[PDB]
Amino acid sequence: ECVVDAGKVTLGTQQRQEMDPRLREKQNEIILRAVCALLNSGGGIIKAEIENKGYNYERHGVGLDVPPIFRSHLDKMQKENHFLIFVKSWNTEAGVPLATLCSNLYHRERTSTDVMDSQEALAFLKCRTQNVSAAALFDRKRLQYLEKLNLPESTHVEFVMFSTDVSHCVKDRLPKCVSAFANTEGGYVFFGVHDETCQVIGCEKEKIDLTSLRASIDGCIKKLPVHHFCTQRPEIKYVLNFLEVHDKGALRGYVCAIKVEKFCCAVFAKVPSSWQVKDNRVRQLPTREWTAWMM
Amino acid sequence: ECVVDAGKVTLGTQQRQEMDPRLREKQNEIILRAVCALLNSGGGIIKAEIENKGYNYERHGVGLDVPPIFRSHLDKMQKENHFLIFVKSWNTEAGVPLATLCSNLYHRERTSTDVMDSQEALAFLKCRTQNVSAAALFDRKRLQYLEKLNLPESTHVEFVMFSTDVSHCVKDRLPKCVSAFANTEGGYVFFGVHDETCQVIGCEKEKIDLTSLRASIDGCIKKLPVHHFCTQRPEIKYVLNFLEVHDKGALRGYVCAIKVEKFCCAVFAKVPSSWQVKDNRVRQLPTREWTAWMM
Amino acid sequence: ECVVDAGKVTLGTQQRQEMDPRLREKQNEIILRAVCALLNSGGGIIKAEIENKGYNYERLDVPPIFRSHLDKMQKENHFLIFVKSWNTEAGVPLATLCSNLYHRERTSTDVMDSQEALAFLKCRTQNVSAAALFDRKRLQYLEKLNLPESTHVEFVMFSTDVSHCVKDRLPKCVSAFANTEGGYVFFGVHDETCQVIGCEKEKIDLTSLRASIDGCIKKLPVHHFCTQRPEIKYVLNFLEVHDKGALRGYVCAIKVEKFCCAVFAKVPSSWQVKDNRVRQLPTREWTAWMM
Amino acid sequence: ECVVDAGKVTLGTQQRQEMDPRLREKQNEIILRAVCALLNSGGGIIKAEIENKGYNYERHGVGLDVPPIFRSHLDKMQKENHFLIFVKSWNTEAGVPLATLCSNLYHRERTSTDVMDSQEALAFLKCRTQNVSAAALFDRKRLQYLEKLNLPESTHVEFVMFSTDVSHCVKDRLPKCVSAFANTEGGYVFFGVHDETCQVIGCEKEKIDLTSLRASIDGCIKKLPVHHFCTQRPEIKYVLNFLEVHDKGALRGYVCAIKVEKFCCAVFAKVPSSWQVKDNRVRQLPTREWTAWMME
Amino acid sequence: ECVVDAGKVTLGTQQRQEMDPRLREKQNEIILRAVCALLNSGGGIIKAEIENKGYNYERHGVGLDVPPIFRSHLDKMQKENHFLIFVKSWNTEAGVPLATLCSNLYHRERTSTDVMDSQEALAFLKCRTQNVSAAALFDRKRLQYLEKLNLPESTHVEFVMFSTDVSHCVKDRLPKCVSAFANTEGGYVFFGVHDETCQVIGCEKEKIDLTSLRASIDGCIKKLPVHHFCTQRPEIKYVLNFLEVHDKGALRGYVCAIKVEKFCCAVFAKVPSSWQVKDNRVRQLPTREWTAWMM
Amino acid sequence: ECVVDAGKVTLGTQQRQEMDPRLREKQNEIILRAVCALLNSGGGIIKAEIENKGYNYERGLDVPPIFRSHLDKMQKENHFLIFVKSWNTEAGVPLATLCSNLYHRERTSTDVMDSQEALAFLKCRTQNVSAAALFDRKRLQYLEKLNLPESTHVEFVMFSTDVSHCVKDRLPKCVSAFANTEGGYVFFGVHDETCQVIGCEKEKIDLTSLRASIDGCIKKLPVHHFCTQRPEIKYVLNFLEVHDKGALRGYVCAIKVEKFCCAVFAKVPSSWQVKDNRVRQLPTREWTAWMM
Ligand SMILES: [Zn+2]
Ligand SMILES: [Zn+2]
Ligand SMILES: [Zn+2]
Ligand SMILES: [Zn+2]
Ligand SMILES: [Zn+2]
Ligand SMILES: [Zn+2]
C-alpha cells in the first residue's frame, strides 16, 4: 500500500563488514525504521539502489541483522540496480499489537537494568492499569577516595562510572536508570563508584559544576516521557545529592547520587521507537499514540 | 650499712614456678626495690625468712627476676631458716649513676613505643639539656564501622584497641603513649583501631561518657611527671577528639583520638622506679631527685 | 454485632506525627487488634474518645486490606470505626495481622503474608563450606570468612546485650530455616563485610546461654500435618574467637534442619472477639482456621 | 655594605594572616632572597615601606616565616613609614659555608624523598668527592584498572598520583624524584598509582599523548642541573615505560613509569636557591658557583 | 519375569556402615543397576546371598542408597541365606517414562552446575524439541599469581580448582561443565581459580604440557554424547585458552580456560545411566535409545 | 710463588656473554677460587689456555673489585696468565674470603655478611607475640591472609616444586640469619608479598621423614663458639595444617630458631688455600680463627 525509499545502501555481508561502521548502522536504522513503519500501518514495499553495483546478490545472503519477528514478515527482492523488500502487515496474533522497534521502557532485575521487549512491556502496562544501608550511603556527607563500599549492587542501587565528560555521561546514562527504577521498586544510582569493585572513584572537582549539573539533572528528568493511568497524575519524585570525595588532605571530587522513587504508572527514557508511515514518509508515532495503541 | 627485711619469701626455682604468681611477683618486687635502694646508697644486706622451709641452698633462681647488672653486685647467703643478700654499692663506673629499676621515660621508634633504659635515658636527658594523612584522620568527623584506614602505624600514629573497660584502658595505656610522643617528634594515638588490620572498631556508645572521659583524659594528662631544663618551662600540648563510628543506619560507637605535640624537655609516665634508703627504710626517690641525680 | 473500646486515642496525621511514638504505636496496635478481631468474627463497631479534643477529622497505620472493610465515623468527642465482616472472597480466610511464619529466600529471611502462608501450609499438607565453618572450633578476630550469606547461612551481629539479642532474633531465624531448606545462623559475624566480630568473653556464659537457646527453641510454636510429629532439630556450637594468641570471644552458631511441617516464631497475631474482649486465638485455632 | 629594597610590604602577624596569601608569599620570598644574598656576600641592610601604615610595630610580629638560622643574623628596625633589616655576614663557624635558601638536592631515604638541608648536602657532596619485583612491574605491559600492586613503596620505588593536568604534573613532580633516585641507590617512580593503597588508576587515555610526553620527559630530565666530580663525567641514565591500564572491555589509561639509575655524583632538580648581590641587585648564583663554593 | 543375581553382598545398616566403603558402594551400585533394569523392562526379582550370614534378620534397615521413587516399587524378602527384592514394573503414572538412575544431563543455574533429574530432563528435552567482563578475562593473556579477579561466578563463568593431577582433574571435571553450559546459555569455565576467593592460582608449569592437554581436552569434548532434534546437526563449539600465570620474576603456571557456546539441542557428560535387561543380562541402554525412549 | 692451572677457558666479554652460562660460571668460579687461594697464601700466578683461540685480548669479567686491585692480566700466545699479589692486610680485613656464609637479617631481608661485617660481628660475639601465636595455631585456612608482617623475626618463604629440595636449600640461610640476629621464625608456604597461606599439597610431603631431614640439615650446619658452655642451636619445627572447604589440603612448614650465643654458618665459608697440590678451601675452624 506504500512505497518507501531508503536510497543509497550497500548490500552484502562481506561488503558491509568492510564498510564504515557509522554509515553501515545509519543505513541499517533507515531500513529498520522503514520496516517498522510499513509493519505498523499496513502492507508496504521498500526500495534502495545498491551502492556497490559491482557486488551482486548471492554474495549477501542473510545480513545487516534483521530482528527475528520482523524477518517472518519481509521478503527479499532484487531487480537490476535496485533492491526491494516486501513487508507484510504486522501480525496481531502474536498477542502483541503494532510492531515496536524498542519500547524504551526500562526495568531493573537483580543487578541489571534492561529495556523491556514488546511482550514484557505489554504485560507491564497491563499490570500498571490495575536498602537501609543504601539510604545510609545516600544520607552520607563525605566519602573517602578509593573507599570500598559494603553496599552491593542490587535491584535498588546501581553503581556506574563516570566517562571522560561528566555532563554527557550523566545526561546519557541517567534516563535509562531513572526509568528502570521508577518502573520497578525505585532505588538509587551512584555515579563515580566502580561496579565490579564497589570502590569510590569521584570525578575530579575541577571537571564538574554542581549547580549547573543539578539544573541539567532536573531538566533531563523532567523531559522524560511519562504516561499515566491513574486519576491524580503526579510527577517523577527524584532527589539529587553530591557526595564529597576527599583523599588525604582535602576534597578531591564528587560522587553524584540520584534517588528515584517508585512510580505509580510508567516512565520512558526516550520517546518509544515505533514508526508509522504518514501520508508521504516514515514518522515515529509519539508517546501517547504508542502507549494507547499498545493498550 | 643497712639492714632491710623482705619478710616471708619462698625460695627455689621449682617452688616459685609452683607458687601463686601474684604473691611471687609481690615478693620479687619487694626484693628488687630493696636491691635498688641498697645499690644507690651505701652497701647493705637484705634478710628474709624462707617460707618453703624444705629449701636447700643452690636450688635458687640465679636471676629469680634481677637485671643482670644487679646480679653482678649482689651475693647470696643462706643461714638456717633465713636468706641474706649482700648488696655492694652501685658502681658509678658503668657511666650510669643512680641504678634505676625502670626509667618510665618512653619514646617511640618506628612502630614501637618503648621505655628507655638507663643509658638511653641518660643520653636522652643529655640531648635535651642542649603525617598529613594522620592530621586528616584526626580532623575527620565520622568513621564507618570496620573501615580500613590507609594511614599506617608509624613514629607519629599508634593504633591501640579498647579493653573491656574503656576508662581503665585509656587511663592505663595513655601515659606511656603521651610520654613516648612527647619525647620523640610527637604524634597521634587512636583508641578503637586494631593495629594489625588498621580497621575501625571503636568502643560501644553505651559504654562511654564523652564529657566524663574527656575530664578523665585531662586529669590523667596533667598528672604526668614532667621535668624541665628550659626557661619558660611549658606544659604538654595535647588535643582530644572523639570520632564517631557508625555502621549501616546510625551511630554505633566512638574512636578516641589524642594528638600529642613534641615536648621541649622530658615527660614521664609515672614517677621513675628508683629507690633510696633514707630514714632506714626503702623509699622511692621522687621525680626531681631522680632526674637531678641522673645529671 | 459487638462493641469494643480503644479508649483514649489521639487522632490526626499531624497530631500523631507530633505525639510520643511509644504511645502512638500502642494506640495504633490496639486499633489493629480490635479491627482484626471484629474482622474475623462478624461485623462490629469500635469507639474511642479523642484525646486532642480540639482536633477533629480532616483538621493512621492501617493495612490496606483492612482499609477496604472499615468506615470512619466522627461523633462529638468520640470516634467510631464500622468494621465489616472479613471478605472470604480474597481467597484467604480470616484476617490475620501477622503470620509469624518466616522463610528465607536468597539472602533475606521474611515473614510470609496471608497468601504466602496459605500456599505454604497447602504445600506442607502434601553448603559444604558452611558445614565446614560450623564444624570449626577456633576463629580469628576480624577473620574474613569466604562463606557468603545465602539461603542456608545468615550472618547476624550481636547487640549490646547478648542474651537479649539471641533471645529476640533467634526465633525468626530458626523459623525461616525450618520452613525452607534449613540452614545455619551465625551470631557475631558482620553481614555486609563477612568478618568475625565475636562477642566479648566476659559478657557471656556458655552453658547458661545454651540452656537459654534450648528453652527458646523448644518453646517455639509448631504445627504438624504428618503422622509422626517430631520436634525441630537444632545443634548449637560456640566458636572460639582469638586475637593475638589470646581468646577474645565467641561466635554463636546455630544449625537448623529443614522441618517436615511449619514452625512459628511467636503465636500468630490474629484476633477474635470473645464475650469479654479481643482475644488472640491460639496456634491450633489459627492453623485450623486457615484451612 | 649594600642597600636592597623590598618595596611595598605588609607588616604584622594579624595583618599578614588577613592579607592575600599570594602577595604574602611573594613579599616573603623577596625578603628571604634579600637576606640570603646579603648573608652570602657581606653585611647589608634591607628597607621596605610598610603598606598598612596605620598598623605599626609591636603588631608587626616576630612571625614572618623566616628560617631560624637566618633570624640569628638579622635585626629588625622600624623608622617612620619604613622598615629595615640589619643583616650580618653569614657565620661560617656552623661548619657550613654560605647561607643557602634551598639546596634543591633531593634524596630518598626509606619511604620519603626529601630535599637535603645545608648540612646534609655538605656531607653528601663530601661523600661523592670520594627490587626484583619492582623490575618485574617495570617490565610489565598492561595493568588492570584498580589493580592492587604487591610491590610496596620503598627506597627504590615511589608511587605518585596524577594531577588534573598530566604534562604539568610530571613536569613539576619528576625533577624531585629523578634527583632523589640519582643521589641515593636509584629506583623507579610510577605515575598513576595511589601510594596509600598501592592501586592502579592512571591518567585517562584521552588526556595524554605518548610520544610528545616522552619528548617532554627527555627534555625535563636532560635540563636537570648536574655537577660532576669524577673523570668521565657521564649523563643521567633513565628509561621511560608507559604501562597500559585496561578496565573491562578495553584500555582506559596509562601508568607512566620512569626508572632512574644511581648516579656517580650529584643531580639537582632546579638551580639551587642561593643568592648573591651583584653590584646593583640580588642575583642567584648558578649551579657551578654554588657547588664549588660549598667546597673549601 | 527375570532373575538377576547380585552375588555376595553384606546386608545390615550397622554392618554396612562398618564395612569397606569401596565394596559397599560397589554392591550398592550393582543393586541399583539391577533394580533400574527390572524397573525399565518388566517386573522381576533380585537375588543375593548374604555375606554376614549371622548378622541379617530385621537388623537391616530401610537404610541403603535407594531412590524413594524406586523404593515405592520394591519389596524386600528374606529366605535362609539369600535375600530377594521384588521389583514392580516402572510406574509410568508419574508423567515420566522409564526409571532413569542419572540423566547425566547437566545445566548451570546461578552459581551451580547440576545434573537434571528425570522431570527436569523431560521438560528440558521437551523445550529443545521446539559476560563482557568474562569475555575480557578470556581474551586476556597474562595473569598474576594470587590476582583477585573481579569477574564473579555466575550462570556464564565457573571458577574451578585444579586437583593434584591436572590431566585427571580437567578430564574428570570438564564434561559436567561443558554439558551444563551447552544446555543453558553457554559460558566460560576457568581452571586454577579458587571459587570462594576468585584468586588466580593455576597449576604449576612443570606439571602440564599445553599441546598434549589441548589434544586431551579436544578428545574429551568430542567424546561426550550429544543428541540432536534439529535439521543440521552440528558439533559443540568450544575454544580453549591457556592464560599464563606469573609471580614476581617470571612464569609460574597456567590457568586453563574453556569457552563453551550455547548448544542447539542437548549435550551429555556420559552415556545416561539407565539400564535394561537384554536377553538375560543387565545392559545399560545407549544414548540414542535413552533419549528416544524418554519421548 | 705458586703455579695454578685453570685449564680450558673461553675468554671474551662478547664471547662469554655468548657462551653457555653453566660452563661460564664453572670457569669463572674456578678463577675466583684460584685468586682467593693465591691471595690468602702468598703471591701467585694463574695460567689457562684460551678456548676461543682466535679471540685474543682487546676483544674484564666477574671478579670482586677488592680482588681486582690485586690481580694483573697478561696474555701470551694461546695462554693467559694472572699475576696475583698477596692479600693486603692493610685493609681492615685480614685474609681474602670469597663469601662469609654468615647470614643475618637486618629488616625484611636476610643477607650474607661481607668481610667487614663478619669481622665486626665475630669481634662483638667474642665479648613477635603474634608470631608466637601463629606458630602455635596448628590449623590454617587456605588463602588465609595473615596479619603478622615480615620483619626481623618472621620470614615468609614460598615452596618450590620440590618441597624437600626447597627446604633443604633455603633453610640454612634462614636459620643462620636468625641465630646471628635476635632469632625468629621462618614459615614455608606463605607468599611474602601477599602474606597469604599457600600450603604445599599433602600428597607431596612426608611429615616424619621431612622432620628428620630438617633435623639433619640443621645439625650439619657449621657452628663456631667463643663462650664457656658451647651448646647446640635451639630450633623447633611445627607443621601447620592448611585446610580449604571440606578438609585438609596441605601444610605450612614453620621453624622457630632461637638467638644463638656465638656464630652459625650456612655452609663451610668460601675461603681458599693453596696446598702443595691445588686450591683447597680451609675449613670452618681455620677460617674463623684466621679472621682473628
Ligand atoms: Zn500515574
Ligand atoms: Zn621544657
Ligand atoms: Zn510433621
Ligand atoms: Zn661524575
Ligand atoms: Zn542441534
Ligand atoms: Zn657459644
XYZ file of C-alpha atoms in Angstrom, chain F:
292
model
C 105.422 -18.394 44.411
C 102.975 -20.956 43.045
C 101.554 -22.087 39.729
C 97.860 -22.904 39.379
C 96.097 -24.137 36.236
C 92.517 -23.176 35.443
C 92.664 -25.144 32.194
C 90.290 -24.666 29.259
C 88.587 -21.267 29.494
C 86.677 -19.367 26.817
C 87.646 -15.694 27.133
C 85.999 -12.504 25.941
C 83.191 -10.252 27.147
C 81.138 -10.687 23.980
C 82.371 -14.285 23.806
C 81.401 -15.066 27.419
C 78.008 -13.365 27.042
C 77.538 -15.668 24.027
C 78.750 -18.805 25.843
C 76.831 -21.468 27.781
C 76.122 -19.783 31.157
C 76.704 -23.010 33.103
C 80.235 -23.513 31.761
C 80.686 -19.734 32.046
C 80.121 -19.781 35.801
C 82.068 -23.029 36.175
C 85.160 -21.391 34.670
C 84.552 -18.100 36.495
C 84.184 -19.759 39.898
C 87.381 -21.742 39.264
C 89.220 -18.463 38.621
C 87.702 -16.916 41.752
C 88.770 -19.886 43.884
C 92.302 -19.723 42.467
C 92.573 -15.968 43.058
C 91.260 -16.365 46.610
C 93.732 -19.146 47.409
C 96.742 -17.357 45.914
C 95.691 -14.160 47.696
C 95.436 -15.870 51.082
C 98.644 -17.885 50.948
C 101.217 -15.649 49.251
C 101.997 -14.459 45.742
C 100.981 -16.492 42.746
C 100.405 -16.800 39.016
C 97.429 -18.370 37.231
C 97.654 -19.974 33.794
C 94.887 -21.048 31.428
C 94.747 -21.979 27.750
C 92.203 -19.887 25.853
C 89.400 -21.893 24.252
C 88.304 -19.436 21.530
C 91.859 -19.123 20.259
C 91.002 -16.593 17.560
C 89.518 -14.247 20.178
C 92.512 -12.653 21.908
C 92.967 -9.530 24.045
C 91.377 -6.173 23.106
C 88.165 -8.090 22.386
C 87.247 -7.643 32.329
C 84.790 -10.182 33.725
C 83.094 -11.188 37.028
C 85.665 -10.619 39.799
C 85.052 -8.719 43.095
C 86.620 -5.241 42.953
C 88.790 -5.724 46.051
C 90.328 -8.677 44.211
C 90.817 -6.637 41.012
C 93.242 -4.333 42.849
C 95.494 -7.370 43.457
C 95.467 -9.029 40.019
C 97.340 -8.134 36.839
C 96.343 -9.589 33.476
C 98.854 -10.988 30.978
C 98.297 -12.513 27.523
C 100.950 -14.737 25.948
C 100.285 -16.810 22.786
C 97.450 -19.300 23.398
C 97.683 -18.957 27.190
C 96.511 -16.299 29.622
C 98.150 -15.583 32.976
C 97.078 -13.664 36.078
C 99.573 -12.102 38.495
C 98.084 -12.378 41.996
C 99.616 -10.219 44.720
C 99.494 -11.342 48.338
C 96.301 -10.287 50.097
C 96.903 -6.880 51.631
C 96.446 -6.857 55.397
C 96.437 -3.062 55.047
C 92.686 -3.262 54.529
C 90.575 -3.644 57.654
C 90.031 -7.339 56.823
C 92.747 -9.998 57.185
C 92.668 -12.878 54.700
C 90.730 -12.717 51.405
C 87.409 -14.548 51.717
C 85.049 -15.153 48.801
C 81.835 -15.470 50.833
C 81.452 -15.486 54.607
C 78.365 -17.760 54.507
C 77.405 -15.985 57.747
C 73.869 -14.655 57.349
C 71.964 -12.082 59.394
C 68.547 -10.467 58.989
C 68.569 -6.658 59.014
C 64.926 -5.742 58.436
C 62.842 -7.585 55.846
C 65.818 -9.215 54.078
C 68.220 -11.894 55.257
C 71.688 -11.132 53.940
C 75.147 -12.698 53.915
C 77.686 -10.591 55.791
C 80.666 -9.236 53.885
C 84.258 -9.438 55.121
C 83.966 -6.304 57.276
C 80.513 -7.084 58.688
C 81.620 -10.618 59.572
C 84.817 -9.289 61.170
C 82.993 -6.824 63.428
C 80.330 -9.470 64.092
C 82.705 -12.161 65.369
C 84.585 -9.464 67.292
C 81.358 -8.368 69.004
C 80.434 -12.001 69.730
C 83.792 -12.568 71.420
C 82.604 -10.188 74.165
C 56.702 -11.057 67.903
C 53.822 -12.092 70.166
C 51.621 -12.503 67.087
C 54.421 -14.568 65.532
C 54.474 -16.910 68.532
C 50.687 -17.077 68.208
C 50.913 -18.069 64.530
C 53.443 -20.777 65.400
C 51.038 -22.270 67.985
C 47.978 -22.120 65.678
C 48.366 -25.667 64.253
C 45.448 -25.093 61.843
C 45.499 -22.548 58.993
C 42.897 -21.954 56.295
C 43.859 -21.927 52.616
C 44.462 -18.386 51.284
C 44.104 -17.023 54.808
C 45.771 -13.609 54.892
C 47.941 -13.454 57.999
C 48.223 -10.107 59.757
C 51.718 -10.861 61.062
C 54.091 -8.912 58.775
C 57.563 -9.946 57.608
C 60.120 -8.472 59.996
C 63.467 -9.154 61.661
C 61.713 -12.055 63.437
C 59.473 -13.667 60.783
C 60.307 -14.626 57.195
C 57.636 -15.773 54.747
C 59.084 -18.032 52.048
C 57.300 -19.972 49.316
C 57.682 -23.637 48.449
C 59.268 -24.686 45.172
C 58.076 -27.607 43.036
C 60.081 -29.999 45.236
C 59.402 -29.500 48.944
C 62.387 -31.447 50.301
C 64.868 -29.734 47.972
C 63.325 -26.315 48.650
C 63.527 -26.514 52.444
C 66.906 -28.277 52.370
C 68.301 -25.495 50.162
C 66.684 -22.385 51.675
C 66.630 -23.343 55.373
C 70.384 -22.959 56.209
C 70.418 -19.292 55.155
C 67.383 -18.602 57.344
C 68.441 -20.458 60.497
C 71.912 -18.906 60.255
C 70.466 -15.405 59.836
C 68.136 -15.838 62.813
C 70.777 -17.477 65.012
C 73.078 -14.498 64.424
C 70.479 -11.724 64.973
C 67.665 -11.902 67.555
C 66.414 -15.238 66.260
C 62.960 -15.555 64.809
C 60.514 -17.630 62.800
C 60.559 -18.826 59.190
C 57.367 -20.047 57.509
C 57.363 -22.209 54.378
C 54.206 -21.978 52.279
C 53.264 -18.328 52.868
C 53.597 -15.879 49.984
C 55.693 -12.962 51.210
C 54.302 -10.155 49.039
C 50.701 -11.028 49.976
C 51.039 -12.785 53.382
C 48.563 -15.458 52.286
C 48.825 -19.129 53.216
C 49.663 -21.415 50.290
C 50.147 -24.834 51.852
C 52.167 -27.418 49.975
C 49.993 -30.274 48.747
C 49.537 -33.031 51.322
C 50.280 -35.730 48.730
C 53.708 -34.140 48.121
C 55.165 -34.302 51.647
C 56.048 -36.855 54.320
C 55.901 -35.290 57.767
C 58.186 -37.513 59.859
C 60.704 -38.017 57.043
C 60.946 -34.296 56.293
C 61.237 -33.554 60.017
C 64.199 -35.932 60.176
C 65.542 -34.156 57.078
C 65.348 -30.669 58.605
C 66.886 -32.051 61.796
C 69.799 -33.428 59.777
C 70.251 -30.229 57.769
C 70.149 -28.091 60.920
C 72.608 -30.270 62.853
C 75.013 -30.381 59.874
C 75.236 -26.575 59.992
C 78.741 -25.180 60.643
C 78.969 -23.600 64.097
C 81.796 -21.770 65.870
C 81.761 -20.960 69.589
C 83.525 -18.386 71.748
C 81.849 -18.944 75.132
C 82.485 -21.348 78.001
C 79.410 -23.516 77.508
C 79.214 -24.416 73.801
C 75.612 -25.559 73.206
C 73.801 -26.503 70.007
C 71.335 -24.288 68.172
C 67.812 -24.498 69.616
C 65.181 -24.919 66.902
C 61.599 -26.172 66.987
C 59.635 -27.407 63.969
C 55.851 -27.226 63.642
C 53.739 -28.469 60.742
C 50.662 -26.252 60.494
C 47.665 -27.863 58.820
C 46.136 -25.963 55.898
C 42.503 -26.786 55.132
C 40.248 -25.467 52.371
C 36.486 -26.001 52.403
C 35.835 -29.662 53.257
C 39.099 -30.956 54.719
C 42.915 -30.797 54.913
C 44.737 -29.777 51.736
C 48.332 -29.173 52.799
C 50.860 -27.989 55.372
C 52.754 -24.801 56.114
C 56.182 -25.729 57.480
C 57.228 -23.431 60.328
C 60.636 -23.360 62.029
C 61.406 -21.269 65.114
C 65.099 -20.510 65.667
C 66.375 -19.113 68.964
C 69.005 -16.393 69.128
C 72.429 -18.009 69.319
C 75.276 -17.218 71.710
C 78.060 -17.151 69.103
C 78.013 -17.561 65.298
C 76.315 -20.018 62.941
C 77.142 -20.639 59.281
C 75.042 -21.976 56.422
C 77.898 -23.817 54.688
C 81.655 -24.031 55.197
C 82.911 -20.484 54.486
C 84.125 -19.986 50.926
C 87.789 -19.141 51.517
C 90.673 -20.898 49.851
C 94.258 -22.015 50.475
C 96.940 -23.403 48.175
C 98.303 -26.716 49.381
C 101.238 -28.478 47.657
C 98.726 -29.754 45.083
C 95.911 -27.302 44.359
C 93.359 -24.896 45.775
C 91.899 -26.340 48.979
C 89.218 -24.456 50.880
C 90.195 -24.021 54.506
C 87.648 -25.494 56.944
C 85.450 -23.591 59.368
C 87.847 -23.676 62.342
C 90.771 -22.364 60.302
C 88.670 -19.603 58.731
C 87.135 -18.215 61.919
C 90.489 -18.458 63.700
C 92.316 -16.729 60.833
C 89.765 -13.897 60.934
C 91.023 -13.181 64.466
